[PDB]
Amino acid sequence: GDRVADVIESSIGDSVSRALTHALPAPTGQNTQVSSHRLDTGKVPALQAA
Amino acid sequence: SDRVAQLTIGNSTITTQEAANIIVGYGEWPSYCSDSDATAVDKPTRPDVSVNRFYTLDTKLWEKSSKGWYWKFPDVLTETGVFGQNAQFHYLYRSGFCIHVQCNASKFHQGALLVAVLPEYVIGTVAGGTGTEDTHPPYKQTQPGADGFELQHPYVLDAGIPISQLTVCPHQWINLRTNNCATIIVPYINALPFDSALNHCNFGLLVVPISPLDYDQGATPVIPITITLAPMCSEFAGLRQAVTQ
């Protein structure tokens, strides 16, 4: 039996590997949606941080 | 979040990481001509994406002694891309514009450009200096094309009017320590619903240094100013053969 708090609230022994991603069905290539012109400040898709 | 921006129209996209918001001239967006404002009866052609896109037309070098320049619209584009072709083949034209003036430097350079749009920008001459000669500006000066034209006397905008009051027009400033571009959206401005893209320039774009460029010996001395612009809601009518003027 356990009693000291640090042992009770311990995560030692967790065998389930948490996954940040998951597979999705993808039988065909993705479709293309209609898009229009965007003239915004704040929104900036083209800029990245490799 | 106001300093960062992306402008996408047609197959062209512009990005900036040092913007100062966006000005929408006279508070209204470009729109197509309504059925009650219109008068010409033929069905117009509205090419959409092939003409409403960004065109980068010219680059000027900003120097410690620069006086300023101006370009006329739609003159700057009458000979470029599908837009130009439509302007030449049609008698009637109308559109708005998204103007994006670019100029970046370094945190050690300084200076400020006033970027403004002045409708019906009529050019005057110095009247032979004494004011007794009734001279008139030549075609190459009233419609300079894509190369634009340098101001002779910026203080009076080469038209007898104070540049100190030019801010009464849609404008932005490119103050090097703050931003590296100006973005102005202009709706169609005229007393007629449509007009000739060749005979009439709806407005002029002025880029004038008010606070001179400066930097210390050793910093990059070549500071370009580039002009990029996009027609918006372009409409054309009165089709016939192509005409350049």
On chain B, the residues whose CB falls within 8 A of the CB of A41 are 1-5, 19, 21-22
Q: What determination technique applies here?
A: X-ray
Please list, in sequence order, all residues whose beta carbon lies within 8 angstroms of the beta carbon of residue B230, skipping any fewer than 6 positions away. B7, B9, B10, B12, B52, B53, B54, B55, B97, B98, B100
Q: Which residue of A has its CA nearest to B99?
A: A39
Report the alpha-carbon distance of residue A22 to residue A10 in Å, rounded.
27
How would you classify the pairing of strands B181-186 and B23-24? parallel
Please list, in sequence order, all residues whose beta carbon lies within 8 angstroms of the beta carbon of residue B108, skipping any fewer than 6 positions away. B215, B216, B219
The CATH topology of domain B1-245 is Jelly Rolls (2.60.120)
**Spacing of C-alpha A13 from chain mean position:** 24
Residue A37 near chain B (CB below 8 Å): yes
Beta carbons within 10 angstroms of residue B174's beta carbon: 25
CB-CB contact of B163 with B208 (8 Å): yes
Resolution (A): 2.7
Comparing CB atoms, the residue among B2, B8, B13 nearest residue A41 is B2
Please list, in sequence order, all residues whose beta carbon lies within 8 angstroms of the beta carbon of residue B82, skipping any fewer than 6 positions away. B47, B50, B51
**Amino acid identity for residue B154 in this structure:** P
Please list, in sequence order, all residues whose beta carbon lies within 8 angstroms of the beta carbon of residue B231, skipping any fewer than 6 positions away. B51, B52, B53, B74, B77, B83, B95, B96, B97
CB contact under 8 A, B1 and A37: no
CA separation (Å) from B198 to A5, A25, B76, B119, B177?
84, 56, 10, 16, 39
